[PDB]
Symmetry: C5
Subunit: 103 residues, 5 copies
């Protein structure tokens, strides 16, 4: 199913704006305590060890929103937003939102 951070799907028309949908996943204090504290210079995502866990939580959040959108009978999510929140300095949450849509 098509997911996009744009407001539309070029060439396709939206017949239905079904609902705003969301997904999240949380990374515990211990995981974020060490994979991020290991960083000493400017370390990118390929090189660093923090990315696969971050990407894992982001994909969990993505698929939750996808599953929710699909189970509402949508065939696209537009206007997708990706947000990161560090709750009590340890709990890094990744939240996704967007509009479940019929095209």
């Amino acid at each position: 199913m098509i997911v996009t951070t744009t407001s539309g799907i070029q060439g396709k028309e939206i017949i239905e704006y079904i609902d705003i949908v969301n997904g999240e996943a949380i990374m515990g204090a211990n995981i974020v305590r060490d994979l991020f504290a290991s960083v000493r210079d400017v370390v990118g995502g390929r090189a660093g060890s923090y990315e696969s866990k971050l990407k894992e939580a982001r994909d969990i959040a993505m698929d939750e929103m996808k599953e929710l959108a699909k189970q509402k009978g949508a065939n696209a999510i537009v206007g997708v937003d990706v947000d990161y929140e560090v709750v009590r300095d340890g709990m890094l949450m990744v939240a996704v939102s967007g509009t479940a849509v019929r095209i």
Copy 2:
């Protein structure tokens, strides 16, 4: 009513831009520290304990915004944003914004 994170609604053009509407809900420190401090690795909202409360908060904020838009005579909200704010060590505030519109 129709709510969308997108700048417009396709096929139904906007007759009047009424106002910027908002809604919020706050999760208390005890509850945030309680349920969000869970997870020892990476856990989604789909299979968690914190989501239920986060989704409760998000839905309240959403309901508030739609109600306010109703009151203002709106029959759609476009350009919707869902953001999150760690207001203290504890609290998370979910804030929703968007433009109350009549189509």
Copy 3:
């Protein structure tokens, strides 16, 4: 005057993109303490005493931006964004931004 979180005003043409405009309002550590950090479970905006103040602050920010756009001879604000920031230990800023425009 027309303020929208959308990129345009349907049916009307933007003649000039005059400037990016801003408004802020800051909430004191005591006010955030007493009203915001009191919340124990989940409290929405209609039920929380925090709201009248958050709305007051947000309305101050919005009015400050509108007037500043008025100063510049604009008759529209487009691409409006609402932001919240913990600016000092215990303090809360609402910052609004947008594009002052002539339709």
Copy 4:
């Protein structure tokens, strides 16, 4: 040159998408303290003594972004975002972003 938080410029087609450009400015710990610490209830931008240094930090970030755009051959910036980040304990950073464009 033209700067806008909207996703485009009306009536003026984009010839080239040159680069995403960025600007920042930072206020010292001292500065945040002396102008924010004093705030008690709700204090807006027009009235607040904090507003001139903040607007100065923002205007510096903007100028630096505009200057980089100009150096890249651009004559407009579109999709401008304004960010506030408490970077060290005491200090506030204002970061701006957008796409440097040719119209």
Copy 5:
């Protein structure tokens, strides 16, 4: 490849929305703490010492995202977002996102 905040590339047709892509880089506590420390009043980037490693970080995040879009078969990135998160005790992450697209 073309990277843009906009949802479309003017005079170019998006023939596939491939995937939402992401890039990150993290600045460790050292070069955050003892490199933003020199800030006094209000200091801009191209006059401060800090627009070196901060920019370097952004470029790594962007380069990561672009490289991932390339591996997915994309030849442009649209709806791009630049985010900043303080991740721990004085640690700055720049996270970028966008939709990997075929034009």
